[PDB]
């Protein structure tokens, strides 16, 4: 039993983390304040669940994380919503003003201010482990906290704990919610200056989600607690091998191994199924091939390319629910003698398969119907680069003109730092071509 | 055989700590240039207020001059 | 979190008292300081704009300041006269007489540290200031002269904060005097370099609406205020209300501020309508969308098809459909494509709140900054070389101490922005 940390970072990264933290508690049978009766072992234990929560001798089991905001009204709210009493105060860490939706802010000027107070707090809770296995970091491409403020914590960790893993799930901005003409400046120099210091990172296109939300579910104009209970549903299925055990259980450390073959090429792409609302699930069972089939459209994946369109380099499913494994190998077979799936010729082709027989949970109130089965399917391929090649066009059109560069002068940082860290990723957008190249 | 394996170990350690090393290196030359550059902003921005007040002083004493006539 | 407020001279005092008197009515807080509202959404953010003083009472952080005592005992005198803080009026008694030199150099210098001692005493009882917004005009001696000294000595004791004006331009259509094309570009030219963003309340547009579009052959100051009190109503909504878009100063400058000089913008207001067509005219989202982008709703008098927008800004109010809301400006993009600038992507953005302005049940508000906006300044740039050719009424302005070289440096500042409002609106993506 290895612990893992989770550390929410800014609005977006706060406001997932409460929709995280609360299907957390449905999925273990923890209640707002934290008593889980079905715990015979008070104050301590060793249990799955363990990786995530820690135990008070009163009963309380409290998340291992850390909320971070450089404004107080984001996390005022949790500071005083439903599961006030899950978090001890010193895991709530506000600053009174914001990053102005500026990176230079986040790293610099404001940041600056809390990290060592950040750090400590994280320290405390490092402390508390037998045996800390890594970081996971929520946070938004898109506003300065959420960029400035975690770049700055990413580099500080690195030298806290060494290569301690760190993954990341990254809010990509999508202009339908989207709060700053800035966003693919921040957006960039966030991913440069974090590229070395994260073992893997999944992006999450708020583009994507909002198509889902609107097409699948039918919310005619979603909102971020619309997003957010679909993404934690996400998350919840990439940390299910962490938090619960069973047979067919496939570590995510294991499936990482497949999907990063080289440490910059390390942006899965997540494609989930089933997302169905109540009034269509009724009395419609979704079979392990439809499901599964449902992981090949591209309707599905939480980042908008194509898949079609590129190579893949890994493939793996993660199950949860009723599910058995000849149902799964008769669905891949089937799939691949159907699908555009084109593996790059230095990979083997097998996909890797886990299976968690925890079944879904639904927050009430929610949109999703409850299933009995899902799967989550987390692929390598060449075209999560389309993701990057959109965001560095922005920044070019904006760059050519210095178009509020000024902004970020004025705080501390230079026009060097905006080159270098869009080389970094044209050089990036490169290595995903060359990936894809046959060997010679 | 063993002394390579010896090798291998103190590689990794030594590579782990090269790069904890030259993060926290460059961590503190952009926090320094950063603070830097944000001063002598700022430093600049008042400069020129400043230099409105003496502008001012001596656009009243001019004032003071011509009603010397 | 909280705004300092300042109003200087006769406009500035006006405005600024109407501003207090509409947000107050939109806050549930009565004349005495008293609350006295159903929705907690007026209260959650009261605070950027009003203090708690002993009694659950809410004190505007307002500034009143002006070189004469009329206005100001008037403002005493009005509905809300009550409600300011006491302390907070900065009255001197000499006068400006229209002269932005005796606002800036001599007169409004001599009241200027009075001032600044509220503003500090305001300031100290802030837990996070944001900044700070002046209402005035730019063409009297007090608001423009004053007003932009003022901000002058504030950015040299607040370097960090924002500093936001509500700037009233001359036009002969509304006032005589003569010296307003002076003042004017003197004061232009202390904001291109002391602001971080300006509206431009244009008294040329306010008089054009009252009189073409809502037909009032005699329009009072009254009739253009409630122009510019609904406006400043419409773009501080963010600031006042939960909200997710530009809901402070700085984000609101990062939006709206590609270049640090361009920071003029157009302000816009839907809907407006005829005592005639206001039977006739339906309130839909279609229509505040088209009303809210046609020159003819602009408080600025430029025609935006005339240049390219940077940067907008769009608040609507009210009830209302926000996927239809979306899709109308998704729609007005499209159509309208090629007077936005290629080159920022992504640069209209769109809030909507829930609660309507009095009187209305959904409204519609605009903020551009657009390289048409240069069409104003050069209306005051003709205006200004017209006298200043023949050197006509200088001596006021030598008569303080000034000489000729910094009406040529104002002049020249001025030309200089129009000069860049052009340089990109002729600019490629390519
Ligand atoms: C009712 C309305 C729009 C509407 C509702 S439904 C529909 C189809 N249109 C706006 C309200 C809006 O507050 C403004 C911003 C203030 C308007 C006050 C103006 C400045 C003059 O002082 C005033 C004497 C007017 O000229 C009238 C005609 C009464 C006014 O009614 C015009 C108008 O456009 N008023
Ligand atoms: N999916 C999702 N996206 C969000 C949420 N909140 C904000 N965003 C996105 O995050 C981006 C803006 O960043 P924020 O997280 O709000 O900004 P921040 O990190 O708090 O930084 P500052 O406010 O500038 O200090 C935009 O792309 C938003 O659409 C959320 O709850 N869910
Ligand atoms: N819109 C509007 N403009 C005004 C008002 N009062 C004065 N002005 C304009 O302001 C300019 C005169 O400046 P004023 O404020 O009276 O001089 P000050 O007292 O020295 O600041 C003229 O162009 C007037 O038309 C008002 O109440 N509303
Ligand atoms: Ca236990
Ligand atoms: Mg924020
Ligand atoms: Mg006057």
Request: glycine share 8%; charged share 25%.
């Amino acid at each position: 039993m290895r612990e893992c940390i989770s550390i929410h970072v800014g609005q977006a990264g706060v406001q997932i983390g409460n929709a995280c933290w609360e299907l957390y508690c449905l999925e273990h049978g923890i209640q707002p304040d934290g008593q889980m009766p079905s715990d015979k072992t008070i104050g301590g234990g060793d249990d799955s669940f363990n990786t995530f929560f820690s135990e008070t001798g009163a009963g309380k089991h409290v998340p291992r994380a850390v909320f971070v905001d450089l404004e107080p009204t984001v996390i005022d709210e949790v500071r005083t919503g439903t599961y006030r009493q899950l978090f001890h105060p010193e895991q709530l860490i506000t600053g009174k003003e914001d990053a102005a939706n500026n990176y230079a802010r986040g790293h610099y000027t404001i940041g600056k201010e809390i990290i060592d107070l950040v750090l400590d707090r994280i320290r405390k809770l490092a402390d508390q482990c037998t045996g800390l296995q890594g970081f996971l970091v929520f946070h938004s491409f898109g506003g300065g906290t959420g960029s400035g403020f975690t770049s700055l914590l990413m580099e500080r960790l690195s030298v806290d704990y060494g290569k301690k893993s760190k993954l990341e799930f990254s809010i990509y901005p999508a202009p339908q919610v989207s709060t700053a003409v800035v966003e693919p400046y921040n957006s960039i120099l966030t991913t440069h200056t974090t590229l070395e210091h994260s073992d893997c990172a999944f992006m999450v296109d708020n583009e994507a989600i909002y198509d889902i939300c609107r097409r699948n579910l039918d919310i005619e104009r979603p909102t971020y607690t619309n997003l957010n209970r679909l993404i934690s549903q996400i998350v919840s299925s990439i940390t299910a091998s962490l938090r619960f055990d069973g047979a067919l259980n496939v570590d995510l450390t294991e499936f990482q191994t497949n999907l990063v073959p080289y440490p910059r090429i390390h942006f899965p792409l997540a494609t989930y199924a089933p997302v169905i609302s109540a009034e269509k699930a009724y009395h419609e069972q979704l079979s392990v091939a439809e499901i599964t089939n449902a992981c090949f459209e591209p309707a599905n994946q939480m980042v908008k390319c194509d898949p079609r369109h590129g190579k893949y380099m890994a493939c793996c499913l993660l199950y949860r629910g009723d599910v058995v494994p000849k149902d799964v190998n008769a669905a891949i077979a089937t799939i691949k003698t159907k699908r555009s799936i084109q593996f790059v010729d230095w990979c083997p082709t097998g996909f890797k398969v886990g299976i968690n027989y925890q079944p879904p949970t639904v927050v009430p109130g929610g949109d999703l119907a409850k299933v009995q089965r899902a799967v989550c399917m987390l692929s390598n391929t060449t075209a999560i680069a389309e993701a990057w090649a959109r965001l560095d066009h922005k920044f070019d059109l904006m760059y050519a003109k210095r178009a509020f560069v000024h902004w970020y002068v004025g705080e501390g940082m230079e026009e060097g730092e905006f080159s270098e860290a869009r080389e970094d990723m044209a050089a990036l957008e490169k290595d995903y071509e060359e990936v894809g190249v046959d060997s010679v | 055989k063993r002394e390579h394996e010896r090798e291998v170990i103190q590689k990794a350690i030594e590579e782990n700590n090269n790069f904890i090393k030259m993060a926290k290196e460059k961590l503190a030359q952009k926090m320094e240039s950063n603070k830097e550059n944000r001063e002598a902003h700022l430093a600049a921005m008042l400069e020129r207020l400043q230099e409105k007040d003496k502008h001012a002083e001596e656009v009243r004493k001019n004032k003071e001059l011509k009603e010397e006539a | 979190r909280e705004i300092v407020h300042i109003q200087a001279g006769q406009c500035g005092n006006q405005i600024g008292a109407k501003f207090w008197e509409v947000i107050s009515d939109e806050h549930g807080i009565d004349p005495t300081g008293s609350y006295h509202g159903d929705s907690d959404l007026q209260l959650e953010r009261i605070n950027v704009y009003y203090n708690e003083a002993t009694g659950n009472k809410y004190v505007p952080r307002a500034i009143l300041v002006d070189l004469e005592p009329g206005t100001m005992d008037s403002v005493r005198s009005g509905p809300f006269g009550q409600i300011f803080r006491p302390d907070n009026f900065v009255f001197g008694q000499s006068g400006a007489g229209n002269n932005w030199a005796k606002g800036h150099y001599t007169e409004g210098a001599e009241l200027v540290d009075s001032v600044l001692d509220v503003v500090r005493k305001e300031s100290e009882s802030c837990d996070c200031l944001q900044g700070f917004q002046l209402t005035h005009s730019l063409g009297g001696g007090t608001g423009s002269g004053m007003g932009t000294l003022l901000i002058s000595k504030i950015r040299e004791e607040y370097p960090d904060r924002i500093m936001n004006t509500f700037s009233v331009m001359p036009s002969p259509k509304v006032s005589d005097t003569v010296v307003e094309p002076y003042n004017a570009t003197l004061s232009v030219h202390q904001l291109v370099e002391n602001t971080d963003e300006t509206y431009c309340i244009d008294n040329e547009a306010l008089y054009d609406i009252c009189f073409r579009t809502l037909k009032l052959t005699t329009p009072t100051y009254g009739d253009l205020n409630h122009l510019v009190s609904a406006t400043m109503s419409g773009v501080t909504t963010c600031l006042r209300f939960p909200g997710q878009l530009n809901a402070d100063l700085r984000k609101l400058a990062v939006n709206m501020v590609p270049f640090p000089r361009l920071h003029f913008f157009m302000p816009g207001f839907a809907p407006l309508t005829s005592r005639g067509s206001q039977q006739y005219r339906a309130l839909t989202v279609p229509e505040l969308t088209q009303q809210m982008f046609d020159s003819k709703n602009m408080m600025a008098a430029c025609d935006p098809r005339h240049g390219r927008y940077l940067t907008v800004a769009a608040i609507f109010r009210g009830r209302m459909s926000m996927k239809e809301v979306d899709e109308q400006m998704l729609n007005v993009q499209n159509k309208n494509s090629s007077y936005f600038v290629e080159w920022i992507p992504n640069n209209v953005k769109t809030a909507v709140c829930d609660i309507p302005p009095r009187g209305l049940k959904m409204s519609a508000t605009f903020i551009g900054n657009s390289t048409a906006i240069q069409e104003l300044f050069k209306r005051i740039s003709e205006q200004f070389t017209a006298m200043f050719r023949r050197k006509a009424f200088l001596h006021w302005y030598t008569g303080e101490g000034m000489d000729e070289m910094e009406f040529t440096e104002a002049e020249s500042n001025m030309n200089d922005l129009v000069s860049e409002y052009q340089q990109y609106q002729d600019a490629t993506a390519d």
